[PDB]
Write a protein that binds this ligand. Structure first.
Ligand code: F6R
Ligand code: F6R
Ligand code: F6R
Ligand code: F6R
Ligand code: F6R
Ligand code: F6R
Ligand code: F6R
Ligand code: F6R
Lengths: 223, 223, 223, 223, 223, 223, 223, 223
């Protein structure tokens, strides 16, 4: 399972990549506008992320019309080969995905909330589909159930579109995604950081360190 | 999963084709007779759909006897290579399917209501079998259970006939067909258009464009 | 399980009542406005339905504010003892239900789309809660799964609010509701009419008539 | 589980009643007309069965209209207190059932092929409902599944209508009805007699009989 | 769960009665004829078992005709109040069971090999029904599945007939009968003795013995 | 299922109670110190919450030693009859719960992370036990599974301690708690507010309002 | 679920009693012989535990013959009304249990390794039966499966013998016993103390007291 | 499944290796410091184990910083080709694993307590990942459930990191690991010794020896 960082915060992206545990980044217009404050331009932020991340970087078009979407998508693609064009699940979005796929531009269909939407995006040739589990949780349905059904549907038809679980809120979204077999999760930094941690890891490390002081006073392993 | 449009209405077909999510069309004598009013003739309707749709186009014979069905099927085949001959599940229909299969004329066995009917159609060599889920629902049995059994039976014997789910009434027939693994669904236009839609997609799109207005006055993505 | 008729059409209600299989009626503002055209007034439609139907008749308030809802609910209550006040699942609607319940005015909480909303309505003391299965089917979620969860939740806490399955589109919504154990279904007239019918009932009746003609050419039973 | 005999053949009924395992009888127009030959009249056949069978005896109306059904029902009732009036699942039949039940005349609703039909018959007050399992088997659906659903539905609502499994063709219909918990099965005579039999019973009897000739030559148990 | 001994050997019964774990006895013509050798008469054997065993003692008739079975059953009854008359699952056997039940003579229907035979014996009023699990195992059918189905059936109808698992061959027949909830098992003596034993029991005692030798060489518990 | 608000924010508590959907409040030392800023005293905050909430108000002791806990608990209890003393799952906490239970002071055992801790608290007589699902989610285990096991354990032993699900982060914790059958959930305000809402409720209300304008221009229900 | 301490060590018993979570004690000749060193005698140990523990205190006989066991059991009973006589699963042990049960001396059958042994002990009238889960684990079978079967068997027959899970090695034996519904677990002291503990309890407690220092310098709760 | 020995005790390792059932060894700082007492040095213990064991030997770094870990890991690697570097699940440990993996130095990520940590370690390229089942049992969570999830996750993504079950306490951890399909278990010596043994193996051997003595008083097989 690949793990993407769901942020436009450059410092978070740097730190996450410096852990070697981040395989790419997803952004969206909200996450970008959060960071485009106090003189920082959205265009510089996008170029900087594309520079520092070796893996895919998902960047969302803002136009709602087919022509504007394909035009913006070609510009996004021109910024670097790791750019992935994020495109909403709409009638025009699907048309744009089909055209862009034929042009060998990688695409990520976003704002997906049920398995049939996901299937339609795959039929259009989309590289990744992003169902939003947290926003489903918000409306009182277990979002992970939609991930499970997409995985089954994609398995049934040997679909090559990757399932990119998005709107992740907690480490159990991540655990359930991995057990289901989703291709990718995208996580906020706070969630990313918690995935490495466990209280018994902390405790066991402290105890081993104390045990070793009985045999080596300076805490080193001299071999 | 392939998605066909279940209509003889030219504008619905034109619209759904232009969306890029319609892989074919199914018709029947009722659908065609609805469009053959105020001047239009059934031959023009059939020829016009064949022209618009690159994928399979299923057209039903009207004869009930073997010889009439085979003669009408050859005339339907003559209209274009993408024509598929729809034939009812009857003794004469099965004989016709076996004859036409040997002539390499694609066939679609219709009016199928249980799994063993579907198996018999497959044994006669039919290209597609169309179980009617909505008409089973109407009589108080969950029509999707028949799709699940047909899928298992066809998997057991490596059967190459495609399951074409028909008499579809709502987007859950479509969801459950995909989870089962049916090869094709054919859907009325009203159903097809709903498949792309979800209120959270609409809410999330409107919110993203509002966020973007905080960094781009004219709502543009300049890169 | 009670079966209500989901219409404001007086001819449909008269017919279903005469069949003896209609235990009540649900209306909403869409249904009522469909009938109050070309002269007929909405207050007259409501009153005629109250007169015809011996069972509960659900009539929805139009105000969105607590004070207006309660005022409208009292005028609804005053039209006849079988009137039930239909109230939307909103903050003001919950407050209205709590007040009307304390006044021994029967209430029906509507526009419910997940099990926790249904629980909230039951906690406000609502007489009936109406989850909309067909509108969930429309957005790609199996609406009956919400009914199943509500039944389990209500069973857990011995809740007395009745589950009134609404937005019903087909006889399998009805079948599954009964298997789950929902208290009420409300159905449109074309669904109601299908519930009695089965092709093997029709076929068996015809056959038994022919059998009887052998021992009695007139077709009567003389005992 | 009560066990009824599904026949109008007086020799079969006598033979089966003579065994102590027959709790009642069901007839229908076909079963009666098969026996009403060679100067034998349907009225005598019915009266004879009523006299010989302590338990319920189900006798089917032939009128298809409400008023004719109620009039035939009362005449059937007048033939004996054990008579039960068999009435088809139609709009007129439901109306007739509701009238007869209020007159304390026992009823049996027949020609039932799905669970919601069975529920409607129970809601009209019918004493017994008879789903036809064999005729469902004939059309490619496992009829016993319908019994299972009706049992669950009736349990959910504490329904007092007895489930009378009809159109029984083999002893596995009977076994499955008992495991489900149906209240009654009605069986043809050939099925009835097979229910007592098993090859290991026969083989065991013969061995014990031979084992006993070792200790007692004449085959007696002198105590 | 009650536990009976399945034998006619007086020494086995005497030994098992000494243990306090045998609740009754079953015999059959094969078992009785094995002990009636070298001048021991079957009449003596039956009387001595009745005297030794406080609980039910099952003794099988030898006639196959109704009158003879009822006559023999009455002689058996007269031998002691704890006598239970064992009667085969046949047409005359069901008739005899019904007659004897009405005479308040306890009965045990034997040579039962499926659940419907067990149901029929229960409907005749039988006190105990004895399905033969070992003989089903012999013919390649898991005999315990029949016990499971009988338990479910008897539970569905609140049947008072006790399930007496017979033809037991090993301790797992016993374990599974207890997990199912059968009322009684009857076991051969070699099975009965095995039920108390387990190698970890034997090992644990020896070790506790050795431990106590450290504290008290005497081997006593002076309190 | 009772719903508590998990906050010490007086404005949130006022608003939640003014919806009639809040059955009590839980606090802890963190939530209280959040509000005890800029001249507001912790003691006034606790008294104010106890004043405005009619249901239970859980207030946590700060002492870690048994004597300090029982002393603080008696002071908390003295502030009002709705006060519940929140006590951590420690050796001294359990001793304090036992003493306080005998004094008829209601208690809430907090910081519970597995089902056996919950059982020990119930054995001590605790009124409520609070397992922390969100903090389990944080460490990579599905916290709701612990709620499920506690419910089963409590069911097994007819335990009267109420399960109070705490550390709730999202509406699916709430839905799963209700399906499991937990006695109480305690939720932050943001979660509380989301429980009432659904996009289809919003949409349906807007549509009904527009439909009614065709029949009543001023949007009122004049009866 | 009752929790007993499985030890003869006086200080462990004293400590666990003072915690309020120990409902009784089990001993065996090995546990006692461990404490009967450096002067202390087994009689003083047994008498001293009986004094400290209000609940049941199980004390094992050392004789292997019926008469010795019954005599030792009467002497154990004489030591206090809370004494329970532990007797192995052997033929003489079962006889002793039956005799002692009639004398109203409470008993505990030990060295039980499968469900049928437990059933036999229950049929002899034993107060508690102790299956050894840890010693089953040692030989490669999951000992908790035996507890689950015993629970089902005892439920089937409304058996009043309490299941006392023994040879417990870890807190998951305890968890699974509670989920199954065993009546009692007996645990070594090391296991008992771990049952109250969890790292997140420790982390959360330390964090709460840190938060409170921001509003109360001396860490006190003044109300 | 490979079986490693989890000890630094050279006498235990020698013994297990001589049995032929030990495929490798795991150590940690606690285990090593237990043996390096009263003269013996830690560097000598490690070297002797590397010499004795032909299979993998896991030796844990003591530094907590990336640079120190890699330096220590290289000195460990240099001691022999069978050395595996054990590295804790921390941010610096993941970085170290990634670096060492690129240097073709085999690694073992330790102190893993949930499936997502195990996934992270596999993504860093670790040779073996060691979840601690016994430490999870200690805190009241069934540690084997984490092994089951890791196996499923690893199967989903065709991950080549081997699952090395650690913190093993009993032979049922071993049994369940094999049923799940874990790649390796590492066991303490007292667990290892039990894996070969079963009381029925011992009993059957004794019996077969007695049987042979009948046909051969010396006890040999002369062929
Ligand atoms: C792009 C899709 O892969 C992502 O940035 C998604 O927009 C977010 O993951 C959605 O998350 P929120 O629901 O928190 O906006
Ligand atoms: C041909 C078979 O695929 C289709 O046109 C079918 O006739 C329809 O799908 C049947 O649907 P209705 O039950 O709505 O006629
Ligand atoms: C009132 C009970 O809430 C009913 O009239 C419901 O409004 C309808 O059943 C909703 O159905 P539609 O989704 O077809 O409007
Ligand atoms: C009356 C209803 O219980 C019965 O006589 C039914 O008509 C028959 O059981 C129907 O059986 P067939 O399918 O064999 O007519
Ligand atoms: C009487 C009925 O309970 C019993 O004695 C049975 O005949 C035997 O249990 C049958 O056993 P076999 O199959 O071993 O004869
Ligand atoms: C008291 C226990 O019922 C509550 O206030 C709990 O402390 C909180 O619910 C714990 O939640 P957090 O994990 O967010 O502190
Ligand atoms: C008596 C029966 O409850 C207990 O003392 C048992 O002897 C022990 O629980 C057995 O445990 P070990 O297997 O550790 O001896
Ligand atoms: C190394 C593999 O990670 C092993 O030595 C582990 O540290 C131990 O198996 C952990 O066991 P304990 O929980 O008994 O220390």
């Amino acid at each position: 399972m690949k793990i993407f960082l769901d942020t436009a915060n450059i410092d978070e992206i740097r730190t996450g990549v410096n852990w070697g545990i981040v395989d790419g980044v997803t952004t969206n217009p909200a996450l970008i506008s959060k960071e485009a404050v106090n003189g920082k331009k959205y265009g510089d932020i996008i170029r900087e992320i594309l520079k520092i991340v070796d893996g895919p970087v998902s960047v969302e078009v803002v136009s709602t019309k087919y022509e504007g979407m394909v035009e913006e998508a070609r510009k996004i693609h021109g910024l670097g080969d790791n750019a992935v064009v994020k495109i909403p699940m709409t009638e025009d979005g699907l048309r744009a995905i089909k055209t862009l796929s034929s042009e060998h531009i990688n695409t990520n269909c976003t704002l997906v909330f049920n398995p049939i939407q996901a299937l339609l995006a795959a039929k259009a040739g989309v590289t990744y589909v992003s169902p939003f589990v947290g926003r489903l949780d918000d409306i009182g349905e277990d979002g992970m159930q939609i991930i499970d059904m997409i995985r089954t549907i994609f398995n049934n038809y040997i679909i090559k579109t990757q399932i990119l679980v998005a709107s992740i809120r907690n480490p159990i979204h991540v655990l359930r995604s991995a057990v289901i077999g989703a291709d990718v999760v995208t996580v906020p930094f706070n969630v990313l950081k918690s995935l490495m941690k466990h209280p018994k890891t902390d405790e066991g490390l402290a105890k081993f360190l104390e045990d070793w002081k009985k045999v080596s006073p300076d805490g080193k392993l001299i071999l």
